[PDB]
Amino acid sequence: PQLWPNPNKLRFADLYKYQGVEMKKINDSIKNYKAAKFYIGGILGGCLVFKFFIDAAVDKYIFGENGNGGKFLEMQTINSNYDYYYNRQFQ
């Protein structure tokens, strides 16, 4: 009633252990952070597993089947034959 804290007439130790409504919200957020450890951990674990499949795919994309080059060397266009020879004459 009258022992309720006052920001002016406050002790240092009491402010350190206040634990008001602001902290009550944070403690509820922390309850979710902890409960999400397996869901988040499962995602990162898959990123670590997916990491090794990506390494082999990059080499497959750059070097190809027999180390002579993969689809990294392929480039395609939508230009017609007239558009290409127009650009050359434009150059």
Please state the closest distance from residue 45 (CB atom) to another protein, in A.
10
Tokens in use for 77? Answer: 């266009």
Please state the closest distance from residue 2 (CB atom) to another protein, in A.
9
What are the φ and ψ backbone dihedral angles of 34, each rounded to 5 degrees? -70, -40
Size of the site for another protein (CB under 8 A): 63
27 binds another protein (CB under 8 A): no
32-45 core/surface letters (b: 16 or more CB in 10 A; e: else)? eeeeeeeeeeeeee
C-alpha 84/C-alpha 86 separation (Å) is 5
For 70, other C-beta atoms within 10 Å of its C-beta total 16
Which 40-79 residues touch another protein, going by CB under 8 A?
40, 42-43, 46-47, 50-51, 53-63, 67-69, 71-79
Residues that bind another protein (CB under 8 A): 1, 4-12, 14-16, 18-23, 26, 29, 32-33, 35-36, 39-40, 42-43, 46-47, 50-51, 53-63, 67-69, 71-79, 83-84, 86-88, 90-91
